[PDB]
């Protein structure tokens, strides 16, 4: 009978998540909960869980509302369609946090003229697919190499020519003797439903937030 | 043109990956928490990654070989071909640790055949492997996909079920579950990309191997 919303457990996301689901009126204590956390005004329930399942919990109907980044439904919506899958969500609201950009990044020493220099390069990512779909719309042939941390690090391992780095602020390429070179998704958070109609109780629950949140 | 090896970079085969190179002979310093360590004896280089993208980056052709476990190479093999491609690699040795089952369980107080999990939510780490099993099995589920916290799905009401990866010597007595079926058992590997390796690195492949085959009858 309670609302099941999922929200990243820790990072990016996690502090506002939380922030945005208490000025709508939903009261929690999080604490290090492994899994749940329960509203003690609400009935509603708080999964908190690695971003990456987000969108998946949503399209395959284990859980209610979800908060998550574009960039990360994005790449799992399209590996779920490559399996032939049908995966499928509603959209209730672009967020106003987790601003962020995907983009191809390449060794300061380098020099760079166009995206045509990106050709045959083996390239690091931690979202292969939203990068094979950009490089295939711009004609570029590549190599993947799929890390799903410390991308940053592939160039100096000798692991990869180039990346493609999800970034905020440019400090981490900085920090990695890296630059910027071509955005290639921007990303924000957002508010997803999944699929299916919930029941009447719920639903209606859903459309009270759904006000604040507006609020 | 050094040879690259991928290992886990913390987890349940890391330690024991870094023992088995030593015990072949291979000497490495590790100076940081970081993705790369070299050989000090060899031109070896040691890539330590979350286990997850061994398989990929042997099917990439990233690195030159890899220790994984095989439920997570068979998870990502089945992920890879389930996407339309061909993932592709050489098994040099299934390797004498990382044993583990990846089982059906439910809650203690079930009342539990295997069509007991007909139409129930299970939640795993694992859903290409699930998937693949209960189609063999013909038992119709809802997929519940968790990276961690697997084992606490059903007592936080998301899933009735799970398929749950168990190592030897451990139990799930703890977190009052029941292993009912194993359906995959998974003990560590050393594996390779596909494509030809030079000369000169198949050479090194091959005194590695020599030696993991005496260190392995050594430690029984
Ligand atoms: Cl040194
Ligand atoms: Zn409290
Ligand atoms: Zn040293």
């Given at each position: ?74 790449e ?11 995966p ?5 609201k ?25 050709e ?22 590549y ?13 100096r391992?000798?692991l ?12 981490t390429?900085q ?18 439903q ?13 459309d009270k ?7």
């Amino acid at each position: 009978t309670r609302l099941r919303i999922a929200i990243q457990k820790s990072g990016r996301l996690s502090k506002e998540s939380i922030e945005l689901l208490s000025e709508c009126g939903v009261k929690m204590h999080i604490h290090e909960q492994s899994l749940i956390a329960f509203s003690t005004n609400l009935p509603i329930d708080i999964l908190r869980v690695r971003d990456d399942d987000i969108p998946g919990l949503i399209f395959d109907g284990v859980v209610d509302l979800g908060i998550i980044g574009e960039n990360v439904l994005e790449e799992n919506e399209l590996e779920r369609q490559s399996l032939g899958e049908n995966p499928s969500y509603k959209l209730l609201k672009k967020l106003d946090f987790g601003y962020c950009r995907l983009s191809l990044a390449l060794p300061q020493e380098n020099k760079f003229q166009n995206l045509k220099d990106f050709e045959g390069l083996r390239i690091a990512t931690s979202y292969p697919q939203l990068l094979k779909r950009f490089m295939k719309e711009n004609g570029i042939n590549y190599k993947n190499c799929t890390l799903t941390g410390s991308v940053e690090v592939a160039p100096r391992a000798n692991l990869a020519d180039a990346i493609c780095d999800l970034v905020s602020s440019g400090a981490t390429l900085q920090a990695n003797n890296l630059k910027e070179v071509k955005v290639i998704y921007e990303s924000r958070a957002c508010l997803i439903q999944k699929e299916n109609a919930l029941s009447k109780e719920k639903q209606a629950l859903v459309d009270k937030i759904m006000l604040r949140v507006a609020g």
